[PDB]
Amino acid sequence: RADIAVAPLTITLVREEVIDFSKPFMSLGISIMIKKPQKSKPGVFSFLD
Amino acid sequence: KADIAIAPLTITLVREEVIDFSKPFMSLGISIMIKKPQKSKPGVFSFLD
Amino acid sequence: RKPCDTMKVGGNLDSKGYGVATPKGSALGTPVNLAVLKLSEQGILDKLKN
Amino acid sequence: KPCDTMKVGGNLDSKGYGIATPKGSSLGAAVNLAVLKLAEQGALDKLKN
Amino acid sequence: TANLAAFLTVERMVSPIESAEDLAKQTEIAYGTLDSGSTKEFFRRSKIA
Amino acid sequence: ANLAAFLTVERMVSPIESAEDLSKQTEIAYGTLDSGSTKEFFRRSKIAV
Ligand SMILES: O=c1[nH]c2cc(C(F)(F)F)c(N3CCOCC3)cc2n(CP(=O)(O)O)c1=O
Ligand SMILES: O=c1[nH]c2cc(C(F)(F)F)c(N3CCOCC3)cc2n(CP(=O)(O)O)c1=O
């Protein structure tokens, strides 16, 4: 149904045995996402802390 | 003179034109090497540090 | 992206990577791979990434 | 040793080492499948640690 | 004076999370992945303790 | 209180963080090897940084 595919498809062993792949254009890994806390420091309210 | 090379050889285009290459086992890049920042003598700036 | 309230910490945990998909035994796969290596050595992938 | 340097910052470019074989060889595809099998099992990360 | 010194001592305490071992070292901040995919299959088929 | 806070923890940080920090200053010099494809990357670069 297709001839060539340009898409972010993960190169795995189970997919190599049916279709071929070229050299990878973008390497990546598993990341960590946090809430990115800012320096929300108030003024007069922090004096009586 | 050899059969297969298992060594850190850089995959380039000019090496692809004569021999073949497999999928990369370890990705890397160019990083920054500096020394570990140890304690330095602060001096007069410690009067109002 | 907005509201710019996230950040990425730590290094990569595994060696993952995306590539160009082609059927097995395709004649165009080797010139496609040569074009991918030419675009990678030219750094135009990093230009489109920026 | 003396454990006095450190690396900061991410990678600046996309580099990667791979197994080299001559063009028209018979073992290159099973070598590539073995590399993919070692990559999916995380044994490369085990040897890297 | 001692209490504000204690609060500023807390202010320069432990840096935020920068590694997976930092995630394993705590239990207050929970975390999750996607319910289906090879990302969860990485941790499901993992060998590192 | 803050002088006790500085004398308590004493966790110094590194001045250089990213690759743009090298272009942001000129007092701390930096170099590569005299020959190699790493220097060819800087020689044939298209990024103004
Ligand atoms: O082949 C696969 N390629 C994938 C490519 C991507 C993307 F990054 F968008 F390209 C993603 N996402 C990552 C996070 O944002 C949502 C989608 C998932 C993919 N999955 C599912 P997995 O099994 O969980 O890896 C595949 O199977
Ligand atoms: O194929 C190549 N493989 C290489 C492999 C290595 C490493 F594996 F790290 F030993 C290195 N080094 C870089 C770091 O310090 C020691 C030597 C240089 C290589 N070069 C020279 P380049 O062209 O400047 O990259 C190649 O050509």
Tab-separated table of C-alpha atoms and ligand atoms in Angstrom:
chain	number	residue	atom	x	y	z
A	1	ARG	CA	0.000	0.000	0.000
A	2	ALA	CA	3.054	2.280	0.299
A	3	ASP	CA	6.433	2.611	-1.414
A	4	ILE	CA	8.609	4.570	1.035
A	5	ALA	CA	7.966	6.038	4.488
A	6	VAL	CA	9.545	9.122	6.054
A	7	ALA	CA	8.172	9.215	9.599
A	8	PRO	CA	9.426	8.913	13.187
A	9	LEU	CA	9.246	5.114	13.378
A	10	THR	CA	11.379	3.365	15.995
A	11	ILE	CA	14.018	1.073	14.490
A	12	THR	CA	13.526	-2.255	16.281
A	13	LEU	CA	14.609	-5.839	15.680
A	14	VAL	CA	11.039	-7.048	15.138
A	15	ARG	CA	10.539	-4.416	12.419
A	16	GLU	CA	13.884	-4.980	10.682
A	17	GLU	CA	12.948	-8.567	9.803
A	18	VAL	CA	10.097	-7.391	7.535
A	19	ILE	CA	11.269	-3.974	6.245
A	20	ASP	CA	14.640	-2.264	5.977
A	21	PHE	CA	15.963	0.959	7.490
A	22	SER	CA	18.698	3.464	6.712
A	23	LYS	CA	21.071	5.020	9.238
A	24	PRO	CA	19.322	7.000	12.012
A	25	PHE	CA	18.958	10.747	11.508
A	26	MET	CA	18.041	11.643	15.108
A	27	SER	CA	19.092	9.737	18.218
A	28	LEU	CA	17.105	10.137	21.421
A	29	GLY	CA	16.304	8.576	24.764
A	30	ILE	CA	13.828	8.401	27.623
A	31	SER	CA	13.375	11.775	29.322
A	32	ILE	CA	12.145	13.173	32.631
A	33	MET	CA	9.436	15.848	32.784
A	34	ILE	CA	8.928	17.925	35.936
A	35	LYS	CA	6.740	20.879	36.875
A	36	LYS	CA	9.665	23.392	36.541
A	37	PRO	CA	9.243	25.385	39.790
A	38	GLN	CA	10.004	29.098	39.578
A	39	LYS	CA	11.415	31.505	42.174
A	40	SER	CA	8.043	32.828	43.335
A	41	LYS	CA	9.365	34.873	46.244
A	42	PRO	CA	6.910	37.490	47.569
A	43	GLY	CA	7.805	40.644	49.472
A	44	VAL	CA	6.359	41.868	52.776
A	45	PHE	CA	4.591	38.517	53.312
A	46	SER	CA	7.952	36.709	53.485
A	47	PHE	CA	9.269	38.994	56.247
A	48	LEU	CA	6.918	37.579	58.898
A	49	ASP	CA	7.764	34.007	57.831
B	1	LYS	CA	43.642	-8.180	5.270
B	2	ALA	CA	40.706	-8.449	7.696
B	3	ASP	CA	37.209	-9.940	7.739
B	4	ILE	CA	35.239	-7.711	10.135
B	5	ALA	CA	36.158	-4.679	12.244
B	6	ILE	CA	34.703	-4.386	15.749
B	7	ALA	CA	36.229	-1.108	16.930
B	8	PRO	CA	35.200	2.531	17.472
B	9	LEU	CA	35.458	3.619	13.828
B	10	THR	CA	33.559	6.778	12.885
B	11	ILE	CA	30.690	6.221	10.441
B	12	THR	CA	31.166	8.725	7.609
B	13	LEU	CA	29.877	9.045	4.061
B	14	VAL	CA	33.298	8.508	2.476
B	15	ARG	CA	33.638	5.215	4.361
B	16	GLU	CA	30.167	4.131	3.233
B	17	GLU	CA	31.253	4.442	-0.410
B	18	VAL	CA	33.746	1.556	-0.100
B	19	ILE	CA	32.450	-0.652	2.754
B	20	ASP	CA	29.160	-1.234	4.543
B	21	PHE	CA	28.051	-0.415	8.085
B	22	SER	CA	25.476	-1.652	10.583
B	23	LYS	CA	23.106	0.220	12.880
B	24	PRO	CA	24.849	2.259	15.619
B	25	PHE	CA	25.251	0.538	18.977
B	26	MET	CA	26.198	3.695	20.903
B	27	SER	CA	25.409	7.304	20.008
B	28	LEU	CA	27.652	10.156	21.102
B	29	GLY	CA	28.577	13.749	20.376
B	30	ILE	CA	31.044	16.532	21.052
B	31	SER	CA	31.073	17.590	24.710
B	32	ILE	CA	32.888	20.091	26.918
B	33	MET	CA	35.795	18.926	29.079
B	34	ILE	CA	36.639	21.252	31.968
B	35	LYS	CA	38.176	20.612	35.356
B	36	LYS	CA	36.054	20.177	38.460
B	37	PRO	CA	35.549	23.614	40.078
B	38	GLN	CA	37.304	23.436	43.438
B	39	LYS	CA	37.510	26.096	46.131
B	40	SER	CA	39.249	29.330	45.150
B	41	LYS	CA	40.597	32.038	47.453
B	42	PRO	CA	37.857	34.718	47.445
B	43	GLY	CA	39.699	37.651	49.034
B	44	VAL	CA	38.370	41.185	49.542
B	45	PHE	CA	35.037	40.246	47.911
B	46	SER	CA	34.224	38.245	51.071
B	47	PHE	CA	33.743	41.516	52.975
B	48	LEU	CA	30.277	41.947	51.428
B	49	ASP	CA	29.775	38.503	49.852
C	1	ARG	CA	5.675	25.569	23.912
C	2	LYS	CA	3.455	27.887	25.930
C	3	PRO	CA	3.002	28.440	28.914
C	4	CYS	CA	6.749	27.508	29.029
C	5	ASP	CA	6.149	25.809	32.384
C	6	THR	CA	8.167	22.602	31.880
C	7	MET	CA	11.824	21.647	31.594
C	8	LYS	CA	13.829	18.565	30.636
C	9	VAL	CA	16.305	17.183	33.178
C	10	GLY	CA	18.747	14.297	33.115
C	11	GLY	CA	20.491	12.509	30.286
C	12	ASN	CA	19.031	9.975	27.897
C	13	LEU	CA	18.192	6.624	29.461
C	14	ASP	CA	18.491	4.446	26.341
C	15	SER	CA	19.803	4.579	22.773
C	16	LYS	CA	16.679	5.173	20.684
C	17	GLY	CA	16.611	6.535	17.157
C	18	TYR	CA	14.333	7.100	14.182
C	19	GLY	CA	15.199	6.227	10.592
C	20	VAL	CA	13.803	6.220	7.079
C	21	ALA	CA	11.571	3.198	6.462
C	22	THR	CA	11.927	1.209	3.231
C	23	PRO	CA	10.740	-2.262	2.187
C	24	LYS	CA	13.130	-5.198	2.220
C	25	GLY	CA	15.061	-5.687	-0.998
C	26	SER	CA	14.370	-2.177	-2.287
C	27	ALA	CA	16.658	-0.711	-4.932
C	28	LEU	CA	16.401	2.884	-3.687
C	29	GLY	CA	17.410	2.071	-0.093
C	30	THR	CA	21.151	2.555	-0.631
C	31	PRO	CA	20.815	5.997	-2.372
C	32	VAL	CA	18.304	7.016	0.324
C	33	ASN	CA	20.837	6.032	3.000
C	34	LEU	CA	23.577	7.914	1.127
C	35	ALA	CA	21.323	10.987	1.050
C	36	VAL	CA	20.636	10.617	4.789
C	37	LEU	CA	24.373	10.420	5.516
C	38	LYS	CA	24.992	13.430	3.255
C	39	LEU	CA	22.334	15.452	5.094
C	40	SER	CA	23.749	14.345	8.448
C	41	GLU	CA	27.342	15.309	7.624
C	42	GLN	CA	26.187	18.646	6.192
C	43	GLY	CA	24.462	19.464	9.481
C	44	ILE	CA	21.232	20.463	7.739
C	45	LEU	CA	19.363	18.142	10.105
C	46	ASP	CA	20.600	20.302	12.983
C	47	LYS	CA	19.567	23.392	11.010
C	48	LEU	CA	16.019	22.084	10.655
C	49	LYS	CA	16.148	21.060	14.323
C	50	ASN	CA	17.007	24.632	15.316
D	1	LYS	CA	42.014	9.337	38.694
D	2	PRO	CA	42.645	11.996	40.091
D	3	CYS	CA	38.863	12.500	39.475
D	4	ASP	CA	39.434	16.219	38.916
D	5	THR	CA	37.468	16.934	35.711
D	6	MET	CA	33.800	16.917	34.735
D	7	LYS	CA	31.673	17.158	31.598
D	8	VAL	CA	28.814	19.641	31.225
D	9	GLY	CA	26.331	20.388	28.474
D	10	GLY	CA	24.606	18.212	25.920
D	11	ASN	CA	26.019	16.731	22.748
D	12	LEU	CA	26.642	19.209	19.945
D	13	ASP	CA	26.381	16.798	17.001
D	14	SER	CA	25.079	13.366	16.012
D	15	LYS	CA	27.937	10.862	16.184
D	16	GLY	CA	27.731	7.091	16.376
D	17	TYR	CA	29.948	4.032	16.063
D	18	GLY	CA	28.886	0.886	14.240
D	19	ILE	CA	30.194	-2.464	13.080
D	20	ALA	CA	31.969	-2.297	9.718
D	21	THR	CA	31.784	-4.975	7.023
D	22	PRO	CA	33.020	-4.983	3.415
D	23	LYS	CA	30.506	-4.400	0.646
D	24	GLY	CA	28.853	-7.523	-0.722
D	25	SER	CA	29.484	-9.595	2.404
D	26	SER	CA	27.222	-12.369	3.657
D	27	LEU	CA	27.505	-11.769	7.416
D	28	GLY	CA	26.474	-8.099	7.534
D	29	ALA	CA	22.744	-8.683	7.924
D	30	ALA	CA	23.075	-11.267	10.783
D	31	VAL	CA	25.622	-8.950	12.431
D	32	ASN	CA	23.096	-6.100	12.185
D	33	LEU	CA	20.328	-8.304	13.602
D	34	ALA	CA	22.634	-9.282	16.480
D	35	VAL	CA	23.395	-5.595	17.119
D	36	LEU	CA	19.657	-4.857	17.220
D	37	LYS	CA	19.107	-7.805	19.576
D	38	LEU	CA	21.846	-6.548	21.906
D	39	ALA	CA	20.354	-3.055	21.744
D	40	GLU	CA	16.810	-4.139	22.615
D	41	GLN	CA	17.915	-6.335	25.530
D	42	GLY	CA	19.806	-3.464	27.168
D	43	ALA	CA	23.042	-5.455	27.345
D	44	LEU	CA	24.879	-2.553	25.698
D	45	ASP	CA	23.757	-0.327	28.575
D	46	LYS	CA	24.898	-3.036	31.002
D	47	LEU	CA	28.373	-3.111	29.468
D	48	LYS	CA	28.392	0.697	29.382
D	49	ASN	CA	27.700	0.788	33.120
E	1	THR	CA	18.450	34.646	64.440
E	2	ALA	CA	18.837	30.869	64.796
E	3	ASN	CA	15.466	30.252	63.131
E	4	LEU	CA	16.228	32.447	60.123
E	5	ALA	CA	19.616	30.723	59.905
E	6	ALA	CA	17.806	27.371	59.877
E	7	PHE	CA	15.436	28.579	57.148
E	8	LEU	CA	18.311	29.814	54.981
E	9	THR	CA	20.066	26.494	55.629
E	10	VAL	CA	16.957	24.775	54.251
E	11	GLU	CA	17.091	27.247	51.328
E	12	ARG	CA	20.451	25.856	50.149
E	13	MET	CA	19.500	22.184	50.555
E	14	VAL	CA	19.117	19.300	48.060
E	15	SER	CA	19.013	20.151	44.351
E	16	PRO	CA	16.046	19.024	42.190
E	17	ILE	CA	15.869	15.683	40.405
E	18	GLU	CA	18.578	15.100	37.795
E	19	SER	CA	18.773	11.294	37.497
E	20	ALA	CA	16.677	8.151	37.743
E	21	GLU	CA	18.552	7.207	40.920
E	22	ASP	CA	17.204	10.455	42.372
E	23	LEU	CA	13.723	9.168	41.514
E	24	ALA	CA	14.493	5.840	43.184
E	25	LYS	CA	15.895	7.621	46.254
E	26	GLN	CA	12.594	9.383	47.035
E	27	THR	CA	8.940	8.474	47.412
E	28	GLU	CA	7.170	11.822	47.902
E	29	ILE	CA	7.017	12.818	44.220
E	30	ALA	CA	5.253	10.141	42.192
E	31	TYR	CA	5.705	9.592	38.466
E	32	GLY	CA	4.161	7.679	35.591
E	33	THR	CA	4.423	6.712	31.932
E	34	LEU	CA	1.972	6.018	29.123
E	35	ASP	CA	-0.357	3.058	29.664
E	36	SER	CA	0.673	1.279	26.445
E	37	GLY	CA	3.772	1.207	24.272
E	38	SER	CA	7.440	0.223	24.112
E	39	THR	CA	8.240	2.854	26.758
E	40	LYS	CA	6.390	0.822	29.386
E	41	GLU	CA	7.745	-2.359	27.781
E	42	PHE	CA	11.255	-1.042	28.455
E	43	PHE	CA	10.616	-1.013	32.201
E	44	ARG	CA	8.612	-4.244	31.974
E	45	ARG	CA	11.451	-6.093	30.209
E	46	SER	CA	14.219	-4.353	32.176
E	47	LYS	CA	17.067	-6.169	33.910
E	48	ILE	CA	18.616	-3.280	35.870
E	49	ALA	CA	17.391	-3.403	39.470
F	1	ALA	CA	21.833	34.048	59.110
F	2	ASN	CA	22.985	34.202	55.489
F	3	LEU	CA	26.659	34.135	56.456
F	4	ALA	CA	25.919	30.984	58.455
F	5	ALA	CA	24.084	29.682	55.375
F	6	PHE	CA	27.141	30.222	53.173
F	7	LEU	CA	29.468	28.715	55.768
F	8	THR	CA	27.131	25.721	56.218
F	9	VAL	CA	26.573	24.123	52.809
F	10	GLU	CA	29.468	25.400	50.622
F	11	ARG	CA	28.290	23.820	47.367
F	12	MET	CA	30.181	25.715	44.672
F	13	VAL	CA	28.906	25.642	41.091
F	14	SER	CA	30.576	25.701	37.675
F	15	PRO	CA	30.768	28.983	35.732
F	16	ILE	CA	30.349	27.402	32.285
F	17	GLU	CA	27.142	25.493	31.530
F	18	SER	CA	26.363	25.440	27.793
F	19	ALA	CA	28.220	25.801	24.513
F	20	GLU	CA	26.927	29.365	24.129
F	21	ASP	CA	28.758	30.214	27.368
F	22	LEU	CA	32.032	29.811	25.460
F	23	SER	CA	30.896	32.435	22.951
F	24	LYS	CA	29.506	34.622	25.752
F	25	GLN	CA	32.952	35.191	27.316
F	26	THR	CA	36.573	35.439	26.239
F	27	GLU	CA	38.623	35.201	29.458
F	28	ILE	CA	38.494	31.396	29.714
F	29	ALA	CA	39.936	30.034	26.479
F	30	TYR	CA	39.052	26.730	24.838
F	31	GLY	CA	40.550	24.579	22.105
F	32	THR	CA	40.418	21.292	20.230
F	33	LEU	CA	43.003	18.891	18.827
F	34	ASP	CA	45.250	20.254	16.069
F	35	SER	CA	43.957	17.768	13.469
F	36	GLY	CA	40.807	15.709	13.039
F	37	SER	CA	37.191	15.707	11.863
F	38	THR	CA	36.193	17.504	15.074
F	39	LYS	CA	38.116	20.544	13.838
F	40	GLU	CA	36.623	19.975	10.377
F	41	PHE	CA	33.178	20.263	11.988
F	42	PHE	CA	34.059	23.764	13.182
F	43	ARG	CA	35.741	24.563	9.859
F	44	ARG	CA	32.758	23.574	7.690
F	45	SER	CA	30.009	24.741	10.067
F	46	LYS	CA	26.996	26.797	8.990
F	47	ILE	CA	25.901	27.999	12.448
F	48	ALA	CA	27.119	31.500	13.326
F	49	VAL	CA	27.769	30.413	16.928
G	1	LIG	O1	7.220	3.180	16.635
G	1	LIG	C1	6.777	4.170	17.520
G	1	LIG	N1	7.078	5.438	17.296
G	1	LIG	C2	6.656	6.390	18.143
G	1	LIG	C3	6.979	7.737	17.899
G	1	LIG	C4	6.551	8.737	18.763
G	1	LIG	C5	6.953	10.174	18.418
G	1	LIG	F1	7.873	10.633	19.314
G	1	LIG	F2	5.865	10.996	18.403
G	1	LIG	F3	7.516	10.179	17.174
G	1	LIG	C6	5.792	8.392	19.890
G	1	LIG	N2	5.299	9.372	20.849
G	1	LIG	C7	6.166	9.802	21.932
G	1	LIG	C8	5.507	10.741	22.944
G	1	LIG	O2	4.514	11.545	22.355
G	1	LIG	C9	3.460	10.785	21.812
G	1	LIG	C10	3.936	9.850	20.698
G	1	LIG	C11	5.476	7.060	20.125
G	1	LIG	C12	5.915	6.046	19.247
G	1	LIG	N3	5.602	4.752	19.476
G	1	LIG	C13	4.812	4.379	20.640
G	1	LIG	P1	5.895	3.548	21.904
G	1	LIG	O3	5.769	2.054	21.739
G	1	LIG	O4	5.453	3.937	23.295
G	1	LIG	O5	7.331	3.962	21.696
G	1	LIG	C14	6.024	3.816	18.635
G	1	LIG	O6	5.715	2.468	18.852
G	2	LIG	O1	37.330	6.808	12.729
G	2	LIG	C1	37.830	7.483	13.848
G	2	LIG	N1	37.650	6.979	15.058
G	2	LIG	C2	38.125	7.633	16.128
G	2	LIG	C3	37.936	7.096	17.415
G	2	LIG	C4	38.423	7.756	18.535
G	2	LIG	C5	38.170	7.098	19.893
G	2	LIG	F1	37.306	6.055	19.719
G	2	LIG	F2	37.618	7.983	20.771
G	2	LIG	F3	39.343	6.617	20.399
G	2	LIG	C6	39.111	8.968	18.377
G	2	LIG	N2	39.657	9.731	19.491
G	2	LIG	C7	38.896	10.840	20.024
G	2	LIG	C8	39.119	11.082	21.518
G	2	LIG	O2	40.431	10.855	21.986
G	2	LIG	C9	41.115	9.715	21.512
G	2	LIG	C10	40.960	9.410	20.021
G	2	LIG	C11	39.296	9.490	17.105
G	2	LIG	C12	38.796	8.821	15.971
G	2	LIG	N3	38.982	9.333	14.735
G	2	LIG	C13	39.697	10.588	14.551
G	2	LIG	P1	38.494	11.945	14.129
G	2	LIG	O3	38.360	12.030	12.628
G	2	LIG	O4	39.004	13.263	14.663
G	2	LIG	O5	37.149	11.636	14.740
G	2	LIG	C14	38.508	8.685	13.680
G	2	LIG	O6	38.688	9.197	12.388
